[PDB]
Amino acid sequence: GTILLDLAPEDKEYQSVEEEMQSTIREHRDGGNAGGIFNRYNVIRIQKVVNKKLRERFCHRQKEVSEENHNHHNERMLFHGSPFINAIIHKGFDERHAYIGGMFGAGIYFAENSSKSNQYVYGIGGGTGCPTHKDRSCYICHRQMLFCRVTLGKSFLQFSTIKMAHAPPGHHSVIGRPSVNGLAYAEYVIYRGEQAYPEYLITYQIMKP
Ligand SMILES: [Zn+2]
């Protein structure tokens, strides 16, 4: 029920996504332990995920949020790395498989920075790395991540560690903005899988300095 459409490297969308990916690369305080050491990706292919049902759910929920947020659905293109990408592009986002170990409670997380999402491609905290060379800084294996469209709506800006099962009353998402001696980069949390849609599937690599 899911068809993948390879975008040509000469198309505007391809280079737009790529530019949105390689420009949001930042140095993390872990010294590149989980995501590995890199400064720019090696994009193999960018494929659009097509599934009318998931889009129907997404647009329905988007309409609900819009109706409950000043007729203005805050759609934002955000990154997402997970060891279960295929399950996402086939079945859609699911809050039943949310990040319980997250800082803002068992919800679905999204990073504005591509590297931060790369930190979760091979699992939580980098996991155990690639399935071939057992290295989470492997420059050989083809990694993947998701450039998704997330519906935030009325966002709730919490900076400290506040766990929760759902979004605050009158809200739809929880945004954690960077704080000194706190979190380094912004995080975006949604507690409904209907508020995200894996628009772009990015197959890439990391480059050794
Ligand atoms: Zn490898």
From Swiss-Prot:
Expression sites by tissue: Ubiquitous; highest levels in testis.
Disulfides per UniProt: none
Annotated effect of mutating H80A: Loss of activity
Ranges for domain PARP catalytic: 8-209
Annotated positions binding Zn(2+): C130, H133, C138, C141
Post-translational modification: Phosphorylated on serine residues by MAPK kinases upon insulin stimulation. Phosphorylated during mitosis. Ubiquitinated by RNF146 when auto-poly-ADP-ribosylated, leading to its degradation. Deubiquitinated by USP25; leading to stabilization.
Subcellular location as annotated: Cytoplasm; Golgi apparatus membrane; Cytoplasm, Cytoskeleton, Microtubule organizing center, Centrosome; Nucleus, Nuclear pore complex
Functional description taken from the UniProt entry: Poly-ADP-ribosyltransferase involved in various processes such as Wnt signaling pathway, telomere length and vesicle trafficking. Acts as an activator of the Wnt signaling pathway by mediating poly-ADP-ribosylation (PARsylation) of AXIN1 and AXIN2, 2 key components of the beta-catenin destruction complex: poly-ADP-ribosylated target proteins are recognized by RNF146, which mediates their ubiquitination and subsequent degradation. Also mediates PARsylation of BLZF1 and CASC3, followed by recruitment of RNF146 and subsequent ubiquitination.
Family: Belongs to the ARTD/PARP family.
Subunit structure: Oligomerizes and associates with TNKS2. Interacts with the cytoplasmic domain of LNPEP/Otase in SLC2A4/GLUT4-vesicles. Binds to the N-terminus of telomeric TERF1 via the ANK repeats. Found in a complex with POT1; TERF1 and TINF2. Interacts with AXIN1. Interacts with AXIN2. Interacts with BLZF1 and CASC3. Interacts with NUMA1.
Name recorded for this polypeptide: Poly [ADP-ribose] polymerase tankyrase-1
Part of the intact protein present: 1105 to 1313 of 1327
